[PDB]
Symmetry: D2
Subunit: 331 residues, 4 copies
Amino acid sequence: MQKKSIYVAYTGGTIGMQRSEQGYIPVSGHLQRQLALMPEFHRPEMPDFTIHEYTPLMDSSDMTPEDWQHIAEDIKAHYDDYDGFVILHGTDTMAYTASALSFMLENLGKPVIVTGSQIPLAELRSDGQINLLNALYVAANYPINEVTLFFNNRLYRGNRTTKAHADGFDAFASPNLPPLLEAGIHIRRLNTPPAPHGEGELIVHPITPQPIGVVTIYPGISADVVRNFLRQPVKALILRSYGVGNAPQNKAFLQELQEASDRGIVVVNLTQCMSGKVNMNALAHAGVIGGADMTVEATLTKLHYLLSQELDTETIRKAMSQNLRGELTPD
Amino acid sequence: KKSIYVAYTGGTIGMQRSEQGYIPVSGHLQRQLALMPEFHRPEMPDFTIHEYTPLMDSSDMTPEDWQHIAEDIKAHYDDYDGFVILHGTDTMAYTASALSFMLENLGKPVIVTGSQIPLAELRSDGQINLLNALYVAANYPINEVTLFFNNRLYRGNRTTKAHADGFDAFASPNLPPLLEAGIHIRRLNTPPAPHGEGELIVHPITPQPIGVVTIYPGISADVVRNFLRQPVKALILRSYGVGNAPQNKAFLQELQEASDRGIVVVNLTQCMSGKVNMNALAHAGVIGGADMTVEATLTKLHYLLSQELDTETIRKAMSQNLRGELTPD
Amino acid sequence: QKKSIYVAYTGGTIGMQRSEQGYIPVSGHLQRQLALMPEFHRPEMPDFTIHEYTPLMDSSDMTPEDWQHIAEDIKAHYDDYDGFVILHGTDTMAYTASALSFMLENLGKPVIVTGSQIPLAELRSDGQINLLNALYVAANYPINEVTLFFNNRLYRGNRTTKAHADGFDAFASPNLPPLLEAGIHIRRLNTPPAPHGEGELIVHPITPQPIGVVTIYPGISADVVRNFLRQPVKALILRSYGVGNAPQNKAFLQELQEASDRGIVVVNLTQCMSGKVNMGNALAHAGVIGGADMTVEATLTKLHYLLSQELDTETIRKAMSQNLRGELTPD
Amino acid sequence: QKKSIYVAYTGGTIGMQRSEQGYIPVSGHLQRQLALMPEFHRPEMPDFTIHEYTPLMDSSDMTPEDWQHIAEDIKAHYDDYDGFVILHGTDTMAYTASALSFMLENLGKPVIVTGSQIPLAELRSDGQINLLNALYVAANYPINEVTLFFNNRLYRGNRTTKAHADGFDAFASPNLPPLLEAGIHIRRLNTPPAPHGEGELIVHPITPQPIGVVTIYPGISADVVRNFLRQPVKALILRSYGVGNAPQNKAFLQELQEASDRGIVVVNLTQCMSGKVNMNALAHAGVIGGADMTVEATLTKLHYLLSQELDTETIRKAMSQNLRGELTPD
């Protein structure tokens, strides 16, 4: 009967750009005007859709948590009026936004698909045409009530993604979890277990910028350098350590970590490996919390989320190791 | 016969069983090798095993240990046809990357390897990795510091430990292997690293105050300022995609101030593979690290900072392909 | 002015209509649908002309007479177009592509054979993708060979085989890389071009030929093999073990030697999925010719080609081991 | 006491020696070498006994009589060992593994068929790896089926095919995952076990059978197909397009119908590298669908069925049924 309706927020990215002598430039309303002339987007199988183009568009490499907040407020404001949501985003920080939204939205009961493209919709052979058409179709026909990220013909759990390549071509990966859905000839919903969720109405949590350090451990890293990473105003520190979560055993380094936790800093340990989980023991005794197999993006946004709420340090430390939105694999 | 020198620094490969799991045991690897006939066959090279004391867990290693290994290779260089460095997997890629810079005009193979299972166990990858490393160092000599794992010989300064949970795996995201060790060993057409024509030159290396950090949405100038406080001499930034980062004045100002103080700031990508292509950061004095791995960049800075080089020369050298660690424009 | 491509719509799912019973061929449907798709009429796309065959053919019903018809169609329109696209059903698409490669000599324009598993008219169709790309590639990245386009790759026609059909269609070129890849950015690969003379195009005739294609297995009897070689058989393709090994019992080898004495051309291919046969001397001493790394499709069509030219048996045996059109990797 | 494994060295390069002429078979060389390799005598390894065939079998020259001899060897030593390893040349290893899967019924101990590209004597040999692993898996990760071990994978025997031989040997199980992976840590996969009965072991006889295995192509003549079906042929395996499609010209279909009408069992397989046949015209001509069976499994299954005293309707029904895990039921 009456078609489903999808809300499309064009927050930024190359999709709506137009050809000029100076090259491709953002042109207000160009995305909307083009879609009006493409019959494939108006077929009976396709949902109705409304585009809200951001003014001005966001350059994803210059985004901040204030922008994540603005996007969530947009979703909240239009939630009861649409059946799903598609967030068009620049690729550079798309995974960060998708991860942050997954924590900010609690008890989500409609699909929120973050996507984008390397090539503008206007170009003959455009991934923008493919990604937007599929995102709209999947949001309407194969709804999954999570914040997802669609790219390279796969629908990933948002807080499990990372931009894996950018030089010459854009590619995203979900290193520690299979996709939730594959969009090939035939759309296939995979048997990937759904994310945890409560049974009430949607809750949209606020988020604000937070002073977090994200650093990589290397042979001989000095306590003096680590001390700097932990100075005010730092509230949390994400350490990327070796293999399953190993680090140098020298006392000076470990004492800087212990003293930081003593004064309320949340220290979390992630692996330097491309995939796999941290299996925590010397760091553990210094107050460091294991981040299991969370991506850097999920860990960084999860900390922003927890620190932005009215929560004490020990509750934050406990929450960081719990699977709140499908971002980590429990032991 | 050819003769290979084995620096046994430590690592799981030489450990033995106990009531409390695998433990380091002095002399265990040597004893086991003496009892395995396949290592003493006519087709294998003669070899010498030098056990380090103490044996090192690779996660405990420092640049001082890299220096000790380089000194060992230097002292025995003219007496052997190649070298094999047995190492723990956790920081194996850092050691291989460091040695590639410390050794200049290398004219013999130096293969770093190890295993996830002790050599003495049934079905050990340790037996396979040592047998192949010895055979390859003697017969398919590639005059570079390489890393052997998962039956592939990679350029050392192009590697990173890609997995460790359940199984160990190494990757060379931006360069194909130099050789593959399947049924038939095959040297690949991967172009050899740049090299001079003189005698081997071994450079010293010492620990250096370097920061390695990741850029994220909204990262504060206050936090970045802390990353650049003394004693920091260099900062490695892992930025978005082809090397993009926030353009807010405060953030860029902190990086500019750091470069004014003589700090070398290098830009790498957060992506798993690909090159950084340098504009706002460039104006703030940031140097592009092309497609270098974090291990290569970190050890390269340790190498340059440990020599008697001025800041401007270090900045120029960081973007140059010195040992095959980066893909030039 | 714009490039102009001739499209021979021989049959196949690509131009069919969806119905309650399944996919059905409908005269004029493909042309009706393409006139309604703006992307096919953009400045960047070539002009094209569609010749719908009457009747439309189910590729599993095709014979060499149909290959002849297609070659005659290409020949009749050769001077008036810049390239050709042959729309075909997937089941025997590789046979047609292989056959055309031998029938056309000194080809100086692209001939791309393609099709799809989903009709072009459907939403998310690979048919729309394959036709758009075939037209664009034939016009802009011309490769003067009979090629086959599928799964976003342009393969040398006489190197292809349909590798899968259950649930999804897939083609493979087991012994040669593609000639071009069509991802975000179309990329011509360094695969060496097929050999060719420097004269005018020559179109050779082809007719059905009595050929046997059989598989060797343990204990295969001389009596059964004798039957495979009875008149009217002119050639027999043997699929033997590994690098080309077969039973060495006298009765078996005698039947093969008697066949070569009768003027039958016996060719040896491997049962393996890829790789070359390397002639071991028992089969070659019985007069068997090695087919190197040729696909069954190339070997079968190559024999049809050579037998249709009325050449001497010795000439045919010699030609089978020669790389005539890029179908084989010489020693 | 350790488990004990019976090793039949039927043929293949594994026990060959080095001479100024290449690899040559030397009687007893495999056994002599293994006695000097400590890794094969460790506490973790089973005891084993080697029965070297005299002469060795050239796998490319094997016949069903050889399959019978191997089966009789297993039968004769079945009650005395905990598992079995069959060393075989690679060219027809998949045929032997497939045939044995049908000949052995109610198998209650592992039977692993394996071999190597390189003799065990050579420095870097896959022979050392394959025999060590086969022995260890047969004793410790027993799977009561006829399996084939190669490329560090343990496949269901009747699902395998030799996929490559030029430069390097490789086997594949196109339509079923391996039953076990022998990587750094041995891992048994969740691949559902093959169907089996409850009684004691039954060893079925097998003899050579007149079977044609042919490939369909555009315009294939009714005359040629008629020749394929001439006496003494009892069965014909057709490899047709995609999911089982073939030409529908009446002369072609009529030759197949006539063959079936005189008792010839005609089975349809795909020309594709993987996948099932789904079947239309051929079905009406008496052709039986072989689902996703390999040529190897279909050819040996026919040898098995034709070698028993069975009516043709029973043989036809059995060909489409999953008897030993060789095919995926609809």
